[PDB]
């Protein structure tokens, strides 16, 4: 007698995409998101970070003073950004453990400068040099002092500084190397100078070393540069008998969140929390690939250049109606899964509402419950080095290879389980949704293996409506259906 | 009358406790358990490691016997803490790499020490200070032997120590830092000094460098240390003309657990494996949120201060009777999973033991499938530093934080993962004993969709107790089912 | 007769082998594999990197030319190997940051040395000494060159040497530091020397140290060896007074993938891609425990010695026909699923192909989904060490540590996460086997509760086919079923 067809679907779309699972090298969903960001616009964002582009100045040369990076005194930034045109225009000097130089002051954030006054009466003050031009005058580095004789002496200098303060003070001060004896002793008179820089708790003597280095801007001659911090109560003794570079007073040292980074990216006007020196870039991606070195709040660096996360169900092609079981259905346009019919007034589809919202829910901020927020850093180590160094730099790039390869194995294991997962629980509630229309039906149908039931009575529109509505009364059909079911 | 509910359903609890998963940001459980240890009582405990307390002395300073660190002579120790209210109260010192003799006699855990007689003939032995009062004597640090003209003269010492033992030798010596030319040859008759102390494959040189620093317990002078460590079948050789502090012997080095840490916490009676500056804590949980510098079997150091491992399912409360589709049963005290009845004999309950230890031991013991135990760590790097230091410091900082990082990643991601497996395994034993009891019934019952089965035959408690013990003969009540159900 | 039974079942194996997932302490499996390589064949292959045995030499006695070392002259290299038999047989010497030369060179890869004309007019060139015979004379180190007086006369040296091509050069130099002051005279004219080595960006000056030293090879004298990197456009400047021992060209200096490694292990003729100093091991497994030193394409270290991934199905004992509800079926091999029967022409076995094919496809290539290729590394760090040394080699040695933690970690994670999906997905295909056939049979057959299908007709081996093919046609038996279910 009597019947009619319900069966039991999900959508599909004409265009999927590729994803990786635990299970599948590629299998074809609907829908996919890309994890890994590997563009960016080219410019340094100015806004929300204190940007300061050391254009012709390295931050070294802008500390000590160099005539051309006289803009730069008593300035601050959250990052210093240093250029590849940049040169030195002064006398020429060198750093012992120049690295740590740059890295202390960048870190700190400010080239504040406070003067002080030291008594050096009994040596003439502010030499300068050809070398070190200040307009159309012979100079010298702003924040030292060149010493040298007066009336043909050089009385041995023994000179004291207290910290009576509550803040660290940041001492600069040098040696210099002459290039010849007539040069030693026309400035300093003995033939052979020393300079002692101590405080209670420590020491450094230099002997300068007469003789000649290659020319550089006219000069045979150096200037060695060096440091020295002096704590809240300490005592800055400077102890020297000739070849003293004086310090002019002290950089206020701050700690906080600067740092510094060499980039030729131009700066631009917009804002962006992540700065590489490729640009700035978004940061509503986990992972990136633009940069290993990067400053701020920053997805994590990673060797992929491309991670696809699945959202949405496996797409399967459409092949009287069918079900789930053959193909997906490409004409359910308003839901995920859904319901066909066949009965006597026709064909027709409507899609569920709960199932759909139910899987949507779960893939809903999926990535989140695992890495909820991007790291803020700001003051790392160096990742790129121009000179051979051994040792220290072979450690330094041991640590950034292994972490870097670690968190490429995490982001890989991420996505394939988050992967599987998304497969799994769209999967499921399709199975929960057939189940549950099975239940509903009791002895009325039965099951024809694709995806459908075949109901055994008569069931017009309003009929198949209470069954999606979950208000259909089998007791209603069950004399009917038993009827046309077992009959022989 | 003629027929009989049964009802499969799982407990519930009035306080339940909410988890992560993979799935939900939030899900409640019936029972949680907390995997980051974040307190500590506050007490170093003295068992099972040998604990010796600094009071007023740095290692260092009992290294080279500081009068008033005289007691630590000869000493040993697992953990050597040292105090920060510790002073130096000796000649005042320095030493070039501090950290790197700190730690490698902290290491070593040992201040065994050996004298040997070298031959000093030429020189007065045993010069003392003011600076450095043992008792009422002016006096010297014990280690060491400050040596000095005699009869106004200084010959060139040149000595020689072989190493004809099984064990490496620690040789710790020094070089004196006049502040005036006055006081340099009234002691070493010349008007400069040299210092060499060499083996058979390194040697060190080391200038004094004489000058005004600022009075520290009265002087202006100062004495700068340096080590040798001389290997079995080497030799010492030491050759100076002036300015030597000599050793008195050597100290054993040895390999082993030891190490050192800074805290103010007091020691005392109790047991704990992991120590922390904050006191020891306890080490049954994973992880740890107390402090990143440890010592001993200890948790790992995370960001998160709470971690929440479910240990129950999915708690759903209690809103004719009604099985699991529904809601869990909070009258079910005896079982996680169960039967409920109603039959011509009332209403009745009852637990599944089997289901409900399957459960049980599926979650006894989850975590340790993955960290079976915690690992013991002894010397270390430091990880917080009192000096603005550069480049090296840096590095310590970047390593330490890439590691943090990684194994509060590692946290997160394991405990969402593990959570999301409990509801899973849950969820199915419930599955497995609904569908055992489906096909246990043949055709003598139909499911009414909220996990009962109507029972289409009279089934006294006897006859639920039979379908409880797997013993229910289906053949027996089939022919009564059949009648009731299709009215044939 | 007039019914027939169908039991679907899996395979099982009389030789099952433990293993771990996240649900089991251990769970037997049919099949595993072993994914820590912990062997090796104890020989370093010559393919299909280039090796150099070192043989009686160190890389630094290569190459600063020490002559029984001559042989090695203008070597090169993608792995270096040293013997801890090696040993030094000229002057007695040693170099400031001795591993950071041998990093430097190790990671060139080659000894190509080129000889350019220095102007030495003024001092005599080429000094020997009876410490370093070449063949019957005295001699020196080949790459260097002992300066010494002419006609009783040292004068000021001051000599340069322009970078005028397109790539870097290594200069390798040293200082005399003579026993005693007839010596320094003798040689120097001067009582104390002084060596300035320059470039327009660096400077290096070295004091020479007069005095004893113990003997080694006749000679209480030592040289102290430095080295200087030219840029391109740079020069070099040499300045001295006394005790230099002068470069005679220098080394080219590449960038590359060379290392070096300290073996005893012999080399032979074979091909692999991974060397440790064990020798070298198959990289066909993702972890190794043979030892944390590598070089090449190797497996990743791990601390445990055994991981087991499980490559087949949870295994049962097979404990009339039944079906998979009790036990597996040892008697099936020939797949992995299959179905048994009893009918009116016998009982008989029959593998399925397509849920066989499945499983075995899932599991095939598993782990390549989440590690896919072994990583090559190259010149790394050290992780062995021979002398105590304090800070630097605390970070080296937390650092490896660290990195060994954390990857120990994810091996033990991945095996028990794969493990589990592995017994997961071919429960599953069990499962959907059973639930197929249960729905092809319609109102034919009942579920007996063990696995196996009561059919309710004859039904014969052509019958049986028609349902193992997905071709059976319910309708054709339903009459006759029906009619043998229902009846009272
Ligand atoms: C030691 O030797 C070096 C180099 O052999 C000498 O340095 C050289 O000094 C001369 C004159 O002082 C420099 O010549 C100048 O060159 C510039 C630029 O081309 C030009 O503007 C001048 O008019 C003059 O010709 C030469 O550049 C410089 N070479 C180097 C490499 O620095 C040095 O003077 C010698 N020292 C002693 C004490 O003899
Ligand atoms: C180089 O300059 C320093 C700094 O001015 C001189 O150091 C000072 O030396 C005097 C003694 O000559 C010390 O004074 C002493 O103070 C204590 C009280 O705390 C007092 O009882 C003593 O009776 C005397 O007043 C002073 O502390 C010290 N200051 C520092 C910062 O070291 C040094 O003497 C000069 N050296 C030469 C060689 O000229
Ligand atoms: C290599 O180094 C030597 C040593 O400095 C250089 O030789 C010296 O060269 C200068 C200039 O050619 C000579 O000066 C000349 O001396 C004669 C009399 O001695 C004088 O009449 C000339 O007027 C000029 O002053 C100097 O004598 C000579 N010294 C020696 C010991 O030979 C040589 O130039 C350097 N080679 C190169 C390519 O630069
Ligand atoms: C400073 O003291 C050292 C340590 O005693 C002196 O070194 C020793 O010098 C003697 C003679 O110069 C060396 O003797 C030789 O020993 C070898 C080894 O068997 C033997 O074959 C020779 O025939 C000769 O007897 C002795 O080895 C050496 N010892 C060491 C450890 O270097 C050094 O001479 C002293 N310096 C001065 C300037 O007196
Ligand atoms: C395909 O997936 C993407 C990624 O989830 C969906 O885009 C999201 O849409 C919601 C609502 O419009 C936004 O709140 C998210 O910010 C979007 N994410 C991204 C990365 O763009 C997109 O809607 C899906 N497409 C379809 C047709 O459903
Ligand atoms: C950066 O330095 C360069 C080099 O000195 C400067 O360029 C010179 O500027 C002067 C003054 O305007 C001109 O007379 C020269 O012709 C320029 N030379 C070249 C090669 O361009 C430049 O002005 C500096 N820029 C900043 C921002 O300070
Ligand atoms: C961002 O800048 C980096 C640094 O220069 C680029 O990396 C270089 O890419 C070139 C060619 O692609 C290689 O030859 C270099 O070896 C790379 N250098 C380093 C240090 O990796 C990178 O490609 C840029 N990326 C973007 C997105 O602009
Ligand atoms: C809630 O979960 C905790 C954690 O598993 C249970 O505590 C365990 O109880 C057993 C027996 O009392 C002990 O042997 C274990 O050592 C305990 N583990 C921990 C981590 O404390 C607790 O029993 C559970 N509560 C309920 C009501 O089931
Ligand atoms: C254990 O000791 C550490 C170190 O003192 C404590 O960490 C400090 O906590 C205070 C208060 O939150 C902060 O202001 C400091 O900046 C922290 N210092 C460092 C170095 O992190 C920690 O709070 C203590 N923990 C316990 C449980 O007592
Ligand atoms: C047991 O598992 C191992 C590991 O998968 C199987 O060995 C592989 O067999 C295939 C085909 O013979 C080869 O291509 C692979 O190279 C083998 N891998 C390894 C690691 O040996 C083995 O076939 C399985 N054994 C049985 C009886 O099924
Ligand atoms: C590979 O070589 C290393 C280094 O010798 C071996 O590790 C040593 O193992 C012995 C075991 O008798 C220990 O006593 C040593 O302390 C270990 N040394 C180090 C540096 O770890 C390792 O066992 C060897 N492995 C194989 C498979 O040959
Ligand atoms: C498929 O095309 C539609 C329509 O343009 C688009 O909205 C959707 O994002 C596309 N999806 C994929 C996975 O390409
Ligand atoms: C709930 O209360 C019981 C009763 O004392 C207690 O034993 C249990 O641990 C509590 N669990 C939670 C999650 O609060
Ligand atoms: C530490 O030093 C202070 C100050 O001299 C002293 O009063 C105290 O007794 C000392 N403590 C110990 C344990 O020696
Ligand atoms: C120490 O050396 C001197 C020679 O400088 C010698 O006379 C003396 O006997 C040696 N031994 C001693 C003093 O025990
Ligand atoms: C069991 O034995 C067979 C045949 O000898 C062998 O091929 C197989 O690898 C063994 N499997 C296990 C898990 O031991
Ligand atoms: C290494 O040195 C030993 C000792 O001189 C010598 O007998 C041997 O021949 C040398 N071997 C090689 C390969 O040079």
Same mark, same amino acid.
């Given at each position: ?135 159309? @005058?012979?100079? #010298? ?6 010493? $040298?004789?007066?009336?043909? !002496? &050089?009385?041995?200098? /023994? ?124 940061? @509503?991606?986990? #992972? ?6 990067? $400053?701020?709040?920053?997805? !994590? &660096?990673?060797?992929? /250049? ?127 949704? #057939? ?54």
């Amino acid at each position: 007698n009597s019947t009619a067809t319900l069966c039991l679907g999900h959508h599909a779309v004409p265009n999927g995409t590729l994803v990786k699972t635990i299970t599948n090298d590629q299998i074809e969903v609907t829908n996919a998101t890309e994890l890994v960001q590997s563009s960016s616009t080219g410019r340094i964002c100015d806004s929300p970070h204190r940007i300061l582009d050391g254009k012709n100045c390295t931050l070294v040369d802008a500390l000590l003073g160099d005539p051309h990076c006289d803009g730069f005194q008593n300035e601050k930034w959250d990052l210093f950004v240093e250029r590849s045109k940049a040169f030195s225009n002064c006398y020429p000097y060198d750093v012992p453990d120049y690295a740590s130089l740059r890295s202390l002051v960048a870190s700190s954030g400010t080239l504040e400068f406070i003067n002080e006054s030291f008594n050096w009466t009994g040596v003439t003050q502010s030499g300068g040099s050809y070398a070190c031009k200040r307009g159309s @005058d012979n100079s #010298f580095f702003s924040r030292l002092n060149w010493l $040298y004789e007066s009336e043909s !002496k &050089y009385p041995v200098l /023994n000179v004291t500084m207290p910290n009576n303060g509550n803040f660290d003070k940041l001492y600069i001060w040098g040696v210099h190397h002459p290039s010849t004896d007539k040069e030693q002793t026309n400035l300093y008179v003995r033939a052979s100078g020393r300079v002692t820089v101590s405080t209670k708790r420590s020491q450094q003597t230099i002997i300068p070393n007469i003789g000649s280095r290659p020319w550089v801007r006219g000069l045979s001659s150096r200037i060695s540069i060096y440091w020295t911090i002096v704590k809240p109560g300490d005592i800055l003794l400077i102890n020297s008998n000739g070849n003293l570079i004086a310090p002019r007073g002290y950089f206020k040292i701050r700690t906080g969140k600067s740092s510094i980074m060499r980039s030729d990216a131009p700066i631009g006007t917009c804002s962006s929390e992540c700065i590489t020196p490729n640009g700035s870039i978004p940061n @509503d991606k986990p #992972f990136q690939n633009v940069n290993k070195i990067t $400053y701020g709040a920053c997805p !994590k &660096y990673v060797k992929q /250049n491309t991670l696809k996360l699945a959202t949405g169900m496996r797409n399967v092609p459409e092949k009287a109606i069918a079900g789930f079981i053959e193909n997906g259905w490409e004409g359910m346009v308003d839901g995920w899964y859904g319901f066909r019919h066949q009965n006597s007034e026709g064909t027709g589809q409507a899609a569920d509402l709960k199932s759909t919202q139910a899987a949507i829910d779960q893939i809903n901020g999926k990535l989140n419950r695992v890495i909820e927020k991007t790291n803020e850093k700001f003051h790392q180590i160096e990742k790129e080095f121009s000179e051979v160094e051994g040792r220290i730099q072979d450690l330094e790039k041991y640590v950034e290879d292994t972490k870097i390869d670690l968190w490429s194995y995490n982001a890989e294991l991420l996505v394939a389980l988050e992967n599987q997962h998304t497969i799994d629980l769209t999967d499921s509630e399709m199975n929960k949704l #057939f189940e549950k229309t099975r239940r509903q039906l009791r002895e009325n149908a039965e099951d024809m293996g694709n995806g459908c039931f075949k109901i055994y009575h008569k069931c017009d529109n309003a009929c198949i409506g209470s069954i999606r509505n979950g208000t259909y009364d089998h007791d209603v059909y069950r004399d009917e259906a038993l009827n046309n079911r077992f009959q022989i």
